[PDB]
Design a protein around this ligand. Structure first.
Ligand SMILES: Nc1ncnc2c1ncn2[C@@H]1O[C@H](COP(=O)(O)O)[C@@H](O)[C@H]1OP(=O)(O)O
Ligand code: NA
Ligand code: NA
Ligand code: NA
Ligand code: NA
Ligand code: NA
Ligand code: NA
Lengths: 217, 484, 194, 145, 97, 194, 96, 49
């Protein structure tokens, strides 16, 4: 929770992790800019769920331990939104967040929990413009893996067969187009039905809450 | 109290035989409470009350006014939560809300087990957990829905639901505050439950499951003894008598005067509220804690026999008298017209004048000099350079409530004049002036902008005011007004 | 159509998975719809709709600013008397006096003291009336400062009156009761019975 | 609303406003909402209408007055309109982004006529009365056409 | 800003279903909200990301570039920096130039 | 915004019983009728045409810039109705521009630069403004209000316990101010002393 | 219903109350409707109501006592409503 | 930033609107240097301001 809070408060004030000391409070770091205090408190509520009584006056070391007591280790809505934006706006065409996790698993052997940390560190060193090449994107994630190695203290081809399945996939697509086949109609109808199931299930669940299992049976 | 006489309000004692007969002593205690209350007032300061069924026009609302006047802290439920209802309860608190009083209005459906549990959880939860942090002293569960024209064979969904509100979820509500008190080891602050009971159980018929609801509540007189909740709840049954509604023409009010000719008492809502608030006096609060109390507040109506046939006769005779007079009236009117002609009754029909709007600029009124010279000091005359006194000579606005004229009517009075309504109708383009033939006939005045049908100023309010208010002032953003 | 089929086979694409899942879901819809229909047959539409939740802690409006409303009540009384909306006979002025007394604190007395003392009786009979009512109300509020507030209904008690004109129109008014002019007398009436 | 209440309250306290004589607050934005630049022009229009009518409109959305404001003893927060027997002066107060503080005082116009002679006043009354009849003529013609 | 290459965008109507592309659930839902019928979004079961197929009839914005003919301006001397006058980095990033 | 000001200025002259602005020039020099009205953001629809519509190569009047300026509402008023060659001092005062306007107007007359002055404030509501006031958390969050069971009528509730941000609106307000000595001479109504 | 005091009254008790009161009213109503439908004014069905002398005397009976007491309205509804020729009411106060 | 950068969902300070106003240059001057509680009358005069 200390890495997650440090990165969120650092990224908001647009400063590196070293610039924001964890001994200082949100009210302190913000100066008099209460506009920015309200955003950080809204972002911490979005992220972790609940908050201490006066989070602005709690030092960030201490805020981290309160969140740690109720924190699963999962990234939560605010972190996930900012990492999606980092990738979609600063990575080169086709370099998805999933391509960037495949690269952190392949090149540095990191599982889902540690990649979460590498991307959080990447968010607080967010490049100013989009990176030009796939080479520059890997160079960036290499540099961000070594910064994560410091902060947590840790030491650091069937592409021809994939190339054909892509061709086959596209030939299928153009044939479907010609035949006026709507390959996705089935899934579309399913998603709609799945929703009307949840809708009815809720109505039936409500009646069970009101009347009780004994009565309804 | 003449011995041999039973008062129109009394308390009852349970005989070993098991009937509830009048008790002169307890009734004295209660009636003396009322006399004291009437001369010196009763305080309810430090009393925490939950009341359901206190809508505008109800007995409950008259009880609520009293609780607040005495400095009680009260939770009112409404099943019709709305700005109209919210503003209603605000105006009650702003008028009657004494020092130390607070009023808390919550939306609540007594038909819902979940609402019952959630409401009591809210009342008892700490302020830190977003509750009131209260512990109730009185519960007044008056919530109910009317069932009329529903005999035995008609009893269905509405009646089964009504019965849930008016019995099964009152038991549930009592049970919840029992659980909350016991959970916190509260053995010495019982909540007094003012049960709204009926003296007539399927006497009149067609009340769906009303009578079954109201009779069932009478078990609580015995359950207080037989179960483990006596220290948490006390039971105070009010047998509520004939209670003339908002004092307007009801099918029940029109026979009230008739019922009273029998030597029997019907009640205003204020009277019945006073009767009920008389059960929260310290004396009868303490009496409830000893043993369950039962208050006959039924104006000796018990004593008129065949109460249904009698009631029904009174209504028949009134309606008969009305119907025959209305018929004989209409026929003697027509017999006059046939004999005397439609001439005779054109020299009868008066000429009524309907108002047209006459919108004014409202320049300030200039008083006569003698009167205006008294306002300012005598010395001011010829003291100011009037080239250096700055004066507002005219003003105007375009805003959510139209012009400065229309906005001021809405700000100050909360509703439009004819002149306000016609100006709004004109601004918003509902109506346009017309001067020339309208379908071959000549016409001067307002016309609906769409239909080009003529419109009288008198009809502008009925035709357009609802739309004027719907599409003026603070409201949902309309995309057509901001470029989509 | 056949070239598509052999390409789908190669790609291990299951062109019909979507429709398969849909048919399965459509069945579990009909299954739930039947359970919900049965409950509506047993309980009825009125009950099933009726039993819906309304309570919500965030909708709880809370009124406690009596300290403000007292000064408003006072000023509203004051101007109603000046304008002759309320006269020295009206009981509304006695009950509105009770409600002001029921909110007596040091600020309220200072408020009435200012407004009543600074009213100029020479401006007319209504100004004199409000000045006298005011002085009496200040005296009351001083005595009842530090006294529990009180429920006191001072209204005219009424009884039913039903009337039918010559043309069979039915009127219902609430009329003053003969010998019952206040609640002290109402309690007496109730004690004597009939 | 707290800052404003506090600054009005302290203006009155410093100039020795009488204990028990609070200013009566009108909060016109309950009805109109906040039109930024125009905010104070609407409030001025209202102040003028209050002075001339002697009617102080109520903040009809004042369901419950913030306990924190009880401390400001020189301010009254009415929820309903009072028809007074007169209002002599109104304070209009505005606060904008970028430290834009503002106060205007508007005094009842009948205080002007104290300054001039009966002859001059009577001439004015005649002239206004004529202009007003002509303005009504103009307005109704301009409205319907 | 390069007055010789003004960046603008032109609305065009997609003539042919586009190639699917990956995006967050949050972003995919945003695309769906705008385009309705004219985009399909589908959860990718493994990643939890979504595929976004923009369909024929959808509207795109394609960047294009205008040559402008005001190439000259009276500009504060190149190198001018509020920092050299003593103004903090925090003020510079808060405030309009 | 300019339409709201034109209508407001017209209605304000009528409220002053001045049917034809040129009547002022019977009493006063062409140099001594002024306009000290202003705006917070001015013609924000023109700003969108400049910054957004142009970017999309949507067709937009070539003079759109002129229509955005805070000082061109007052320009159109002079160019369509007044024809004064008097003062023109246009305040930007955010939420306080109307009171700033009165202040400038008063001082402009007391300096002798003007005997009559148009005065007041105006601002529109549009998508971009609404969003930014939201990003600053200055405006009430309508979804929060709904959670609390508030209708739009009751979402602007000043000095209340539960007050929760301002409700944005649109429009204009104009006053005509002059030397009392002139108001008396002209026989125009006098609604108040500034 | 046993061991169910006031605060325990829930699904079972609300259901029990439906069996033992509301659906007895319904049952009576149905045979009323069927007789009237066929103009049967002179063959009343005698309803032997099972009533209780003890109403919340013992406690912990859930809504037993409310069920059994409610039935006592039928003594008056026979007079007040239009079903007297179709049903007669015969309350049995059943002992130990 | 308000009208174009926001439209492109480019990241832009949440208080960007405050920084656009003609009267906030004078605000920053007062809030960083002057600390006056004196007049603040901000003209829009196009080329003549
Ligand atoms: N479902 C319900 N839940 C709670 N209170 C109810 C319900 N239905 C009706 N009420 C209340 O019962 C009261 C009965 O009053 P009366 O004595 O005139 O019959 C109503 O004014 C109403 O208050 P409300 O309308 O605010 O819900
Ligand atoms: Na009229
Ligand atoms: Na307005
Ligand atoms: Na409210
Ligand atoms: Na209100
Ligand atoms: Na807004
Ligand atoms: Na700036």
């Amino acid at each position: 929770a200390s890495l997650l809070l440090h990165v969120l408060v650092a990224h908001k004030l647009k400063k590196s992790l070293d610039s924001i000391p964890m001994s200082k409070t949100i009210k302190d770091l913000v100066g008099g800019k209460s506009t920015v205090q309200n955003e950080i408190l809204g972002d911490l509520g979005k992220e972790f769920g609940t908050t201490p009584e006066k989070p602005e006056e709690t030092p960030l070391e201490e805020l981290a331990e309160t969140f740690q007591d109720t924190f699963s280790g999962a990234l939560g809505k605010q972190s996930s939104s900012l990492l999606s934006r980092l990738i979609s706006s600063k990575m080169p065409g086709g370099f998805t967040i999933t391509v960037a996790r495949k690269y952190l698993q392949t090149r540095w052997g990191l599982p889902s929990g540690r990649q979460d940390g590498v991307l959080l560190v990447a968010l607080s060193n967010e490049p100013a413009a989009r990176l030009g090449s796939e080479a520059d994107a890997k160079a960036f994630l290499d540099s961000m893996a070594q910064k994560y190695a410091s902060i947590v203290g840790v030491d650091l081809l069937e592409e021809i067969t994939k190339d054909h399945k892509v061709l086959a996939r596209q030939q299928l697509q153009v044939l479907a187009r010609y035949l006026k086949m709507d390959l996705d109609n089935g899934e579309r109808k399913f998603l709609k039905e799945k929703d009307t199931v949840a809708e009815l299930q809720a109505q039936l669940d409500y009646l069970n809450a009101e009347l009780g299992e004994f009565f309804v049976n | 109290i003449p011995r041999e006489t039973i008062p129109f309000l009394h308390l009852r004692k349970k005989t070993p035989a098991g009937d509830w007969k009048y008790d002169r002593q307890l009734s004295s205690l209660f009636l003396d409470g009322l006399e004291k209350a009437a001369f010196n007032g009763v305080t309810f300061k430090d009393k925490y009350v939950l009341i359901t069924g206190a809508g505008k026009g109800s007995i409950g609302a008259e009880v609520l006014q009293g609780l607040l006047q005495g400095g009680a802290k009260v939770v009112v439920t409404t099943s019709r939560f709305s700005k109209q209802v919210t503003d209603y309860y605000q105006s009650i608190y702003a008028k009657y809300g004494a020092k130390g009083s607070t009023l808390i209005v919550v939306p609540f459906n007594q038909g819902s087990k979940q609402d019952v549990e959630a409401l009591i959880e809210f009342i008892y939860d700490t302020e830190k957990n977003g509750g009131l942090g209260w512990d109730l002293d009185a519960i007044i569960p008056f919530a109910a829905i009317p069932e009329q024209g529903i005999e035995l064979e008609h009893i269905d969904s509405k009646s089964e639901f009504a019965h849930r509100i008016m019995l099964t979820n009152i038991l549930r509500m009592m049970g919840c505050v029992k659980k909350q008190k016991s959970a916190r080891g509260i053995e010495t602050r019982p909540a007094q439950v003012i049960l709204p009971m009926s003296p007539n159980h399927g006497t009149f018929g067609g009340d769906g499951m009303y009578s079954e609801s109201k009779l069932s509540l009478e078990t609580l007189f015995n359950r207080w003894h037989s179960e483990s909740w006596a220290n948490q709840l006390t039971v105070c049954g009010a047998i509520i008598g004939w209670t003339r509604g908002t004092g307007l023409m009801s099918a029940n009010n029109i026979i009230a005067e008739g019922i009273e000719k029998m030597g029997v008492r019907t009640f205003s809502q204020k009277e019945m509220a006073f009767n009920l608030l008389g059960l929260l006096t310290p004396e009868v609060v303490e009496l409830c804690q000893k043993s369950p109390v039962m208050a006959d507040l039924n104006g000796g109506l018990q004593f008129v026999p065949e109460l249904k046939e009698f009631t029904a006769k009174l209504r028949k005779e009134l309606v008969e008298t009305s119907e025959v007079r209305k018929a004989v009236s209409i026929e003697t009117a027509l017999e006059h017209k046939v004999v005397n002609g439609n001439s005779a009754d054109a020299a009868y029909a008066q000429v009524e004048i309907q108002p047209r709007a006459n919108i004014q600029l409202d320049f300030p009124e200039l008083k006569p000099y003698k009167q205006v010279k008294q306002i300012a000091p005598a010395e001011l005359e010829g003291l100011l350079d009037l080239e250096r006194v700055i004066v507002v000579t005219g003003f105007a606005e375009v805003g959510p409530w139209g012009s400065a004229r229309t906005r001021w009517e809405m700000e100050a009075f909360g509703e439009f004049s004819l002149e306000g309504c016609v100006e709004m109708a004109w601004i918003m383009g509902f109506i346009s002036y017309h001067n020339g033939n309208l379908k071959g006939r000549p016409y001067t005045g307002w016309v609906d902008s769409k239909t080009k049908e003529p419109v009288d100023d008198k009809d502008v309010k009925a035709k357009y005011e609802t739309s004027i208010l719907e599409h003026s002032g603070i409201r949902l953003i309309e995309p057509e007004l901001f470029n989509g | 159509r056949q070239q598509l089929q052999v390409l789908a086979r190669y790609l291990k694409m299951d062109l019909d998975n979507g429709e398969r899942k849909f048919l399965k879901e459509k069945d579990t819809v009909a299954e739930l719809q039947a359970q919900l229909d049965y409950l509506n047959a047993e309980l009825g539409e009125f009950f099933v709709n009726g039993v819906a939740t309304s309570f919500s802690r965030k909708k709880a409006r809370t009124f406690d600013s009596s300290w403000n409303w007292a000064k408003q009540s006072l000023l509203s009384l004051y101007f109603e008397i000046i304008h002759g909306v309320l006269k020295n006979v009206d009981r509304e002025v006695v009950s509105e006096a009770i409600n002001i007394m029921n909110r007596s604190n040091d600020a309220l007395i200072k408020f009435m003291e200012y407004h009543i003392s600074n009213t100029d009786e020479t401006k007319g009979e209504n100004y004199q009336l409000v000045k006298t009512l005011g002085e009496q109300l200040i005296e009351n509020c001083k005595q009842v400062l530090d006294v529990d507030p009180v429920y006191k209904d001072v209204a005219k008690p009424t009884g039913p009156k039903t009337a039918i004109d010559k043309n069979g129109n039915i009127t219902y008014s609430e009329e003053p009761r003969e010998k019952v002019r206040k609640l002290s007398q109402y309690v007496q009436e109730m004690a004597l019975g009939g | 609303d707290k800052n404003e209440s506090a600054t009005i309250n302290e203006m009155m306290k410093h100039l020795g406003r009488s204990e028990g004589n609070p200013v009566i607050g009108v909060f016109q934005k309950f009805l109109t909402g906040h039109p930024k630049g125009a905010a104070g022009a609407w409030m001025m229009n209202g102040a003028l209408q209050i002075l001339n009518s002697g009617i102080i409109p109520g903040n009809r959305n004042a369901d419950n007055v913030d306990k924190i404001l009880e401390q400001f003893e020189y301010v009254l927060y009415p929820s309903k309109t009072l028809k007074t027997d007169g209002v002599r002066a109104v304070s209009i107060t505005s606060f904008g982004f970028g430290q834009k503080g503002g106060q205007a005082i508007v005094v009842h116009p009948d205080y002007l006529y104290g300054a001039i002679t009966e002859d001059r006043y009577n001439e004015y009354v005649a002239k206004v009365s004529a202009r007003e009849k002509s303005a009504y003529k103009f307005f109704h013609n301009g409205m319907i056409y | 800003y390069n007055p010789e290459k003004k960046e603008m965008i032109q609305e065009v109507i997609v003539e042919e279903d586009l190639e699917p592309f990956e995006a967050s659930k949050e972003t995919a839902e945003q695309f769906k909200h705008q385009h309705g019928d004219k985009v399909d979004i589908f959860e990718i079961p493994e990643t939890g990301e979504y595929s976004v197929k923009l369909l024929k009839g959808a509207t795109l914005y394609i960047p294009k570039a205008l040559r402008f003919d005001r190439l000259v301006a009276g500009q504060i001397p190149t190198g001018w920096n509020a920092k050299t006058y003593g103004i903090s980095d925090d003020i510079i990033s808060q405030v309009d130039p | 915004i300019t339409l709201f000001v034109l209508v407001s200025v017209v209605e304000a002259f009528i409220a002053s019983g001045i049917t034809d602005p040129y009547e002022m020039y019977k009493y006063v020099h062409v140099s001594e009728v002024g306009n000290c009205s202003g705006s917070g953001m001015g013609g924000v629809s023109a700003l969108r045409g400049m910054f957004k519509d142009r970017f999309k190569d949507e067709p937009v009047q070539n003079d759109i810039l002129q229509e955005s300026f805070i000082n061109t509402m007052s320009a159109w008023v002079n160019m369509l109705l007044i024809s004064s060659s008097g003062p023109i001092k246009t305040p930007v005062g955010a939420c306080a521009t109307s009171v700033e306007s009165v202040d400038i107007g008063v001082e402009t007359i007391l300096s002798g630069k003007a005997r009559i002055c148009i005065v007041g404030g105006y601002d529109d509501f549009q998508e971009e403004g609404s969003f930014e006031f939201g990003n600053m958390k200055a405006t009430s969050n309508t979804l929060e209000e709904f959670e609390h069971g508030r209708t739009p009528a009751e979402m602007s509730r000043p000095a209340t316990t539960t007050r929760n941000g301002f409700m944005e609106a649109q429009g204009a307000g104009i006053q005509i101010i002059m030397q009392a000595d002139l108001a008396l001479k002209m026989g125009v109504p006098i609604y108040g002393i500034v």
